[PDB]
Amino acid sequence: SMFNSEIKEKYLDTLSEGMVMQMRPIFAKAEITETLYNKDIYDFTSMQILELIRSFDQTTIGSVRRTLALLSLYIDWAISYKLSKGLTNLARTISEEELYECLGDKKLYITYSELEEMENQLVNYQSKAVLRLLFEGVSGLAHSELLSLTKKQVEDAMLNGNVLTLYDSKHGERKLKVSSECLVIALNAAQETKYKLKNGKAKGQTKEVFLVENDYVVKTKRTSNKGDGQASKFVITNLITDISEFFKINFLTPNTIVRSGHLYRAYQLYKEKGVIDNSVRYQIIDDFNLRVKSKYRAVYSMQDYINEEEVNKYYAEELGLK
DSSP, rough: OOTTTTHHHHHHHTSSSHHHHHHHHHHHHHEEEEEHHTSSSGGHHHHHHHHHHHHHHOOOOOOOOHHHHHHHHHHHHHHHTTTTTSSSSSTTOOOOHHHHHHTTTTTTOHHHHHHHHHHHHOHHHHHHHHHHHHHOOOOGGGGGOOOOOHHHHHHHHTTTTTEEEEESSSOOEEEEOHHHHHHHHHHHTTTEEEEEGGTOOOOOOOEEBBBOOBSSSOOGGGGGGSSSOOHHHHHHHOOOOOOOOHTSSSSOHHHHHHHHHHHHHHHHHHHHHHHHOHHHHHHHHTTTTTTOOOOHHHHHHTTTTTHHHHHHTTTTTTTTOO
């Protein structure tokens, strides 16, 4: 049930029915953590608040933000009544980046709105570009479509109905329609000369590093001593690592971002159609001009993630669900 239950009821008794309904599940899930530290939420450290929220296994930044606000209210009450050892509301000190650290460990995919919010906190165009380009499906075997991507293909796409010409090292050319935002971000990435470490929060030392000069959207650091050619596989991984390190998240990989793109498209079709079935999966293959052995085999793989349960989970708010 509840740790420090007497005091909890005291607070619960002050609330509306709706609020009670919201709060009671939180205190019940909290209980295991509270009894682990042998103290109440109102005496939790910041780190303990973030661990707490994660234990609720929430899937979207939207829901984490609402949970945090509910808890901030309980903490102000505990302060007013001097139950709290501490004089200040530790939930209110949680930063925007730290909200990501509250995301549950079941989380595998990012919504479109989380993509946008993440992009807006990332200072390096190398970071923004790789995140968005992957989401929009610029990938290929060993990321060869992304690593061979040039300014010229980007410029050409802007004047060709936003249709990119992509080069894979295994198979041939492929046409992919992307967004204007994707293309403008890529164009900027392809001229970036510097890259700031720890996403512009580097501690003393060397805060920036030089990037190689070339026409590629993805660029090696000068220090890597690789020359002016295409970056390798590891550069994509290194850039995703830096994004992940800033947000302190553990689910973000190149394949996860790619799939997130497909999942967004599924959401859009599901909102209009009301079902996710094989016909939707086929439409997604066509919309991303998906690189496949066969389409039926591809449709089969997609059942793991392109389905109504994953869509209802990640896009509950956008769908108007509880």
